[PDB]
Design a protein around this nucleic acid. Structure first.
Ligand code: MG
Ligand code: MG
Ligand code: MG
Ligand code: MG
Ligand code: MG
Ligand code: MG
Ligand code: MG
Ligand code: MG
Ligand code: MG
Ligand code: MG
Ligand code: MG
Ligand code: MG
Ligand code: MG
Ligand code: MG
Ligand code: MG
Ligand code: MG
Ligand code: MG
Ligand code: MG
Ligand code: MG
Ligand code: MG
Ligand code: MG
Ligand code: MG
Ligand code: MG
Ligand code: MG
Ligand code: MG
Ligand code: MG
Ligand code: MG
Ligand code: MG
Ligand code: MG
Ligand code: MG
Ligand code: MG
Ligand code: MG
Ligand code: MG
Ligand code: MG
Ligand code: MG
Ligand code: MG
Ligand code: MG
Ligand code: MG
Ligand code: MG
Ligand code: MG
Ligand code: MG
Ligand code: MG
Ligand code: MG
Ligand code: MG
Ligand code: MG
Ligand code: MG
Ligand code: MG
Ligand code: MG
Ligand code: MG
Ligand code: MG
Ligand code: MG
Ligand code: MG
Ligand code: MG
Ligand code: MG
Ligand code: MG
Lengths: 49, 197, 106, 172, 127
RNA sequence: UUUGCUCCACACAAUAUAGAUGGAUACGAAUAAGGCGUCCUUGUGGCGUCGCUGAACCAUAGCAGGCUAGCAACGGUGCACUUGGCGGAAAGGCCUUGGGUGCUUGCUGGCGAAUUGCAAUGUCAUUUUGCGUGGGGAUAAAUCAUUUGUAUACGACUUAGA
RNA sequence: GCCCUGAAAAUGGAUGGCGCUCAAGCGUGUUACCUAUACUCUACCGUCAGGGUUGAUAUGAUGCCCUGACGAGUAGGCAGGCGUGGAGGUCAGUGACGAAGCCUAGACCGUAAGGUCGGGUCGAACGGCCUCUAGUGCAGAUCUUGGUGGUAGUAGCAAAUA
RNA sequence: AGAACUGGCGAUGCGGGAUGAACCGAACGUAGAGUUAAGGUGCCGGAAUACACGCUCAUCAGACACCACAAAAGGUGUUAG
RNA sequence: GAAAUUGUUGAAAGGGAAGGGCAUUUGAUCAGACA
């Protein structure tokens, strides 16, 4: 028929599936764009909250 | 004719290249196709770009996973054109498709092997000169394909090495013709001429 | 020599068929290097072997053979119709086959 | 309707007591066979005189052969035709080597340009335009200019095997 | 040893099983003709089983012959067996199933002497 | 847990086969333009030549290819070795060196072949596995149970224990 | 004329799909080629029809032999047959040296209803032929009575303090 | 929704129209060989990526009767009159 | 001491049912006929 009243959906489809992760250690899916002029160093670090 | 036929996709028209590739399989002929990024489609780029988005919207409503899958890669755009020409849901169909391999660029083995062409699908022999047409690689890159630049990089590298090969070869074949000539006018040579050689 | 081949290579294409109904009693054969009905008239009557292998030895061999004959040409591009003693298995659609040179008429 | 021959057909109103020896009319008729030719004859005749086949007689049928079958010629062609929405007279010019070739391509042209099928067309007159410069349509005049020469650029050779080992070339 | 005869041509070896006899246990394979109104079988739609019909009937010349050329004839005792004395090339004796073991050897023995073929010698054979 | 694993070698045994039966024979690019040879001022250069199909090129003779001799060549080629080098797109293949060795139908010789009976694929491929033999080499782990709570309906997850 | 505008709907989607652009599009022409239970020729079955043949001394006169044409089928008619229980006749039928019954991707006859055999199991009776007879043939009827499943080791077995 | 004449479906499968009671072709005993119908022959898929002359370029082209729609009105797109 | 339905053993097959038709491969299995 048609909603009747409009409302935004409930929640974000960009975070599906909402399943348990494959690991405790979330993955870096991307690193900073490389500028080969600067000196060498890391681009991340491990820690505990 | 030959155990494997390697086809330089370049400068061929998808559904004509497909139509012959399909038949070839069904008849027992193994085939590999290369440079599918340099494959052609009649119609200006915009037309086929619009066409491709038509393809994009089709998807299983309740679950976009069960639904039609959209591969963006030039080889894989090709394979779609091809699979549709094969009864791919039968043993015999699954069989024929396995005699097929498609590739962007020309990866090893196939780059030292010779590639052939299919004149009845060559663009330059088929399209009326003047008509607008489309390159797979540019089309794909427009709909998501991630790897045009890399293929291009690797190819230019490949094209260099092969230019050495050729040069090296054209050198050797010049010598051969030279030798082959200082043997001309001899008896054996005149005899062969007589017999068509 | 390196070659010994006394036959001509060939391919089991389909059965005789309509759009939706096939007739296993006639096979269709693509004969290497034959392009026209005229061309294929040469081969009419030549005998054809489909040669396959098996796990059980029998009359002392692991190689069996279905035998047949070319019977008539088929359509415009050198394809040929054939019958066999027993119809060919249909898994063979796309398999090779040998056409011999006998009965000779040269 | 096919590959035409041209026929002289002659017919004439079945004789009668008070009119033995009626008058005899001829038509030249482009048809593919004599059967169609005799039909066409009666078709136009009942369009001109009070007769029909029933009460009339074909007297003589003869194929006419081109006078100079290897002479190139500029044909002026006159046609009556029916379109979807009306009917229309029309003049075309055709260059070929015989009136019979010419009428082949007219029917071809009428069909290709105006969607006119054979039933819907009437040849009014086909006649040899003798003096050039009474040739009127350009697409013909074009082929009368002196010392004519033209290339045939972008050559497409037909491949006889499916695969090729070259990459072709359209030089010519 | 049988009379000579033309090549025996069987015309339809495949058994005519009942429709759906393979689908529900309660439906025997014994032929039974569909009478129903909509039925694919009775309407002979391309794809289903054929039905028996008079075209399939065997050559008058070879009908009833069994592979060896002999029409078979059921036989209970010697007297029975002996009815084929002037017909050895044409009939074969088949010993009835309820004939005892010891009676079978008397029949077999006589059949030999008369040169009468028996189709199931080995029945109850105290081997 | 009854001497197990792995790589190379052969041997027997099975099991297969979407279909060996001379060779998948490598520039790139253009097509209203090119390839190749050659010259030169090295260029969108001069000159010559080719296409019009791979109907080509290469290979191809010898008990499915036996056993032998010689000559002319110094060439070809198979194989296992060794030298230098190149290839990461899926390189896992290509090139080069040097001796050794087999073959050579480049030419000329001696011997053999039948009876598989007038045809019958007439059996020469390559897949995977299993079992002993001995030539190199290697001597773990996971799970249950226990346990943590960064986890959890049960499984699962995450810790911990000589 | 073809093409373009005029041309707006609800899951994603249909010239049948792929895909096709000097078409694999539109108009027209010319050949060739593919393939219906249709047409032609042939074998076999059955139906109808026309002939021929009582002459003994051998086997069907409802027979035997020649010839021709035809074959869709609900409702429905008729015909020739298959199978059951019991009855008259008969084969001096089968059988404790194993009747009947039951089992059996073993054999054989029939277009079919069905028939025959082998092997296993069994334990007291039973069948062929000509006739007679009917409580005579099942998949259905939310059919009758009995037996049995999937559901499923599932819903659950949680009020009344322990 | 209701008549007229015929042909059909109902009662009928077979080939074609992807699909489909009625359209097209053709009506059925068991089969071999041939030839065709209607409809097709790039590939799906048996069968010319045949021949031949035109036309058409669509930033929602078009693609075969029944049949699964489109109209008035316009275009200095292009074709021939 | 049938059938539904069940356990075990043996053989096979199985990418969103299964079963069926024409045909042949492959495995298993079997009658007849030779003289
Ligand atoms: Mg709303
Ligand atoms: Mg997980
Ligand atoms: Mg004249
Ligand atoms: Mg019933
Ligand atoms: Mg119904
Ligand atoms: Mg009905
Ligand atoms: Mg296989
Ligand atoms: Mg040049
Ligand atoms: Mg140069
Ligand atoms: Mg130059
Ligand atoms: Mg070459
Ligand atoms: Mg040798
Ligand atoms: Mg690879
Ligand atoms: Mg020698
Ligand atoms: Mg060991
Ligand atoms: Mg439509
Ligand atoms: Mg189509
Ligand atoms: Mg056309
Ligand atoms: Mg028939
Ligand atoms: Mg007939
Ligand atoms: Mg009837
Ligand atoms: Mg009738
Ligand atoms: Mg009865
Ligand atoms: Mg009774
Ligand atoms: Mg009773
Ligand atoms: Mg059973
Ligand atoms: Mg038997
Ligand atoms: Mg027993
Ligand atoms: Mg018993
Ligand atoms: Mg008792
Ligand atoms: Mg009675
Ligand atoms: Mg009753
Ligand atoms: Mg019933
Ligand atoms: Mg019941
Ligand atoms: Mg009923
Ligand atoms: Mg019940
Ligand atoms: Mg109950
Ligand atoms: Mg329990
Ligand atoms: Mg519970
Ligand atoms: Mg409760
Ligand atoms: Mg309590
Ligand atoms: Mg009608
Ligand atoms: Mg009714
Ligand atoms: Mg009908
Ligand atoms: Mg149909
Ligand atoms: Mg339709
Ligand atoms: Mg398809
Ligand atoms: Mg085809
Ligand atoms: Mg042709
Ligand atoms: Mg119309
Ligand atoms: Mg208008
Ligand atoms: Mg206009
Ligand atoms: Mg008991
Ligand atoms: Mg089994
Ligand atoms: Mg079968």
């Amino acid at each position: 028929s048609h909603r009747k009243y409009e409302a935004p959906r409930h929640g974000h489809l960009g975070f599906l599936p909402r399943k348990r992760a494959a690991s405790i250690r979330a993955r870096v899916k991307a690193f900073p764009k490389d500028d080969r002029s600067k000196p060498v160093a890391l681009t991340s670090f491990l820690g505990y909250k | 004719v030959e155990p494997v036929v390697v086809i330089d996709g370049k400068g061929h028209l998808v559904g004509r290249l497909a139509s012959v590739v399909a038949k070839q399989l069904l008849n027992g002929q193994k085939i590999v196709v290369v440079r599918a990024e340099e494959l052609n489609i009649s119609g200006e780029f915009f037309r086929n770009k619009l066409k491709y988005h038509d393809f994009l919207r089709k998807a299983t409503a309740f679950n976009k996973t069960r639904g039609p899958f959209h591969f963006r890669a030039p080889s894989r755009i090709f394979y779609k054109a091809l699979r549709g020409m094969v009864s791919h849901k039968t043993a015999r169909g699954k069989a024929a498709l396995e005699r097929l391999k498609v590739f962007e660029g020309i990866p090893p083995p196939y780059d030292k092997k010779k590639r052939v062409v299919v004149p009845q699908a060559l663009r330059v022999l088929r399209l009326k000169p003047g008509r607008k047409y489309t390159t797979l690689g540019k089309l794909s890159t427009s709909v998501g394909w991630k790897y045009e630049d890399v293929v291009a990089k690797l190819e230019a590298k490949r094209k260099v090495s092969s230019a050495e090969y050729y040069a090296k070869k054209r050198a050797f074949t010049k010598k051969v013709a030279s030798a082959n000539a200082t043997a001309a006018e001899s008896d054996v040579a005149k005899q062969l001429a007589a017999l068509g050689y | 020599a390196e070659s010994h081949r006394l036959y001509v290579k060939g391919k089991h294409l389909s059965y005789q068929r309509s759009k939706r109904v096939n007739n296993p009693n006639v096979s269709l054969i693509k004969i290497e290097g034959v392009a026209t009905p005229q061309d294929a008239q040469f081969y009419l009557g030549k005998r054809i072997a489909y040669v396959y292998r098996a796990s059980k030895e029998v009359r002392g061999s692991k190689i069996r053979v279905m035998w047949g004959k070319v019977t008539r040409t088929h359509g415009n591009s050198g394809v040929v119709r054939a019958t066999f003693r027993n119809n060919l298995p249909a898994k063979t659609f796309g398999a090779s086959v040998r056409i011999f040179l006998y009965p000779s008429n040269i | 309707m096919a590959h035409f021959k041209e026929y002289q057909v002659i017919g004439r109103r079945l004789p009668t007591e008070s009119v033995p020896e009626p008058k005899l009319f001829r038509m030249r008729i482009f048809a593919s066979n004599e059967v169609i030719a005799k039909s066409r004859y009666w078709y136009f005749l009942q369009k001109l005189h009070k007769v029909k086949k029933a009460s009339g007689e074909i007297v003589s049928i003869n194929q006419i052969n081109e006078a100079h079958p290897t002479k190139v010629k500029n044909f002026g062609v006159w046609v009556r035709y029916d379109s979807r929405s009306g009917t229309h007279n029309m003049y075309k010019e055709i260059r070929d080597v015989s009136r019979v070739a010419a009428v082949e391509t007219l029917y071809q042209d009428m069909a290709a340009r105006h969607r006119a099928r054979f039933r819907s067309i009437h040849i009014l007159k086909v006649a040899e335009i003798e003096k050039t410069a009474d040739v009127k349509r350009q697409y013909v005049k074009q082929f009368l200019t002196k010392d004519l020469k033209f290339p045939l650029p972008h050559r497409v050779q037909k491949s006889t095997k499916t695969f090729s080992y070259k990459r072709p070339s359209t030089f010519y | 040893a049988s009379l000579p005869h033309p090549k025996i041509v069987k015309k339809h070896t495949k058994k005519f099983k009942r429709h759906h006899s393979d689908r529900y246990h309660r439906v025997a394979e014994n032929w039974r003709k569909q009478k129903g109104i909509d039925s694919v079988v009775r309407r002979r739609f391309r794809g289903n089983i054929s039905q028996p019909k008079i075209g399939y009937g065997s050559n008058k010349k070879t009908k009833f012959l069994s592979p060896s050329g002999h029409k078979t004839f059921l036989v209970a005792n010697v007297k029975d067996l002996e009815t084929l004395t002037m017909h050895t090339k044409t009939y074969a004796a088949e010993i009835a199933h309820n004939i005892s073991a010891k009676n079978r050897v008397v029949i077999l023995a006589r059949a030999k002497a008369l040169g009468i073929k028996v189709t199931n010698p080995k029945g109850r054979l105290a081997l």
